[PDB]
Design a protein around this ligand. Sequence first.
Ligand SMILES: O=C(O)CCCc1cc2cc(Cl)ccc2n1S(=O)(=O)c1ccc2ncsc2c1
Lengths: 256, 247
Amino acid sequence: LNPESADLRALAKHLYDSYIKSFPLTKAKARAILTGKTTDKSPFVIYDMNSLMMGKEVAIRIFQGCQFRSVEAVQEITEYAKSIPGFVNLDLNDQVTLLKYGVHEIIYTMLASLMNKDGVLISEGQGFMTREFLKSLRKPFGDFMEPKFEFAVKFNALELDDSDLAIFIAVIILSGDRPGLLNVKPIEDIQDNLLQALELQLKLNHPESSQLFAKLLQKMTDLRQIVTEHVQLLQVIKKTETDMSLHPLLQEIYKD
Amino acid sequence: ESADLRALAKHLYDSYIKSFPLTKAKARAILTSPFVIYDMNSLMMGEEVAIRIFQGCQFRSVEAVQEITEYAKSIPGFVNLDLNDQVTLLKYGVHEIIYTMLASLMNKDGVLISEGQGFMTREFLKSLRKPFGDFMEPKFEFAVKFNALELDDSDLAIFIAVIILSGDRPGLLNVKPIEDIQDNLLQALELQLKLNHPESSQLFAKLLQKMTDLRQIVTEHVQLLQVIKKTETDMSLHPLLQEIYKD
Ligand SMILES: O=C(O)CCCc1cc2cc(Cl)ccc2n1S(=O)(=O)c1ccc2ncsc2c1
């Protein structure tokens, strides 16, 4: 290669490294747990009430647990964000805006890593809660996870690994078509670079996968819908469950 | 190889020119002489006001759907798909294409209408009643961003075909051949933008990301269209007219 796509490989390497250091449960660990494996080890499976207890009603602590984890993930993603070259040099206000619109799309992207068609890993991989148990939860909580699984099954079909995902989520943060950005130009120059990095990375890592770059970027449409749909379901849960609390961090991100 | 990709591109451009009366090249020249509609008086002396304007947007959309349908049938492979699947792809595709192509007819201040014989002001449209004042605005906001890419008709012809061959539409029966065709169209689009816009880095990626905005415009637009159902309704003189305009 030439010394320009060489700078692109170094950026890919930097981002992957930051990704490993920022996120405790990688796709590689998640698949080892889900699949096999002598590396890593067996999850306790929650598929019903008694299994849940072996692990204030249940639909609601399950939702409460999920939202605490969300906040947990926002902290991890925010820590990854800082490592993206150029990010912390941007107008502070735009850093906040990029994160605000970025984190949930990233959350559901990385959530796919922890999912198969049958359920999702929980508690850093020590548990596995089935899709059917989640869906059997009560109106409305019953289908708050379903659009996540639907996306995940289609996304996981791309067979990305962590080194791919690391650049992808960086692309997502550095959008610049985000509402209310002050300096779009500096943001777009960064994303242009990241998109180059992602394109080279996918050609090298998935040579036989045609137009993976285009198909992965199209997935960005699925994410936005999940987020939009989740936000609305949340508005509903708030009004019907007036004793349901939301974390102010998530509320602050949700406001608008 | 680049052989089939350039023929694909040329073919779609030719079909695009044939199927769509007003091209972007044509519209851009005019935007830079049309009857301007800035007021009620200009609307009248060039023609329920806000309702006549909405129903005119409907007439135009119905026309556009037929133009898009004809274009689709020109996309190599499209007519060989399961017919249910062709109908599904057009069904969920035309709104996104309608607004994509509408951006060709807009600047930040207004939109061409009636074959470019007219031009309706963004402020006049925005000044309309409720809810008829918020229906066009999000399209102007999309258009301002989309037009920043400065695509031309030969770029758009292929992009439009990419949108039509979306293998993720609900209820598709055989997704494989649809993705197979889109893959080829994506290749052709990538090479087109690389040849036509060498100095514009990652234009292919930027355009694809625009699809997420498209989808949201369409989604929130159909949600306003239901709200319009809770405005005007039962009139036994419409029926045949109402039938012509489904969704
Ligand atoms: O193992 C990990 O790293 C935690 C993996 C994720 C996770 C941990 C967890 C713990 C409990 Cl007690 C309950 C649900 C849990 N989930 S989750 O998948 O349901 C989830 C997470 C984020 C999120 N944001 C919007 S909806 C949503 C749902």
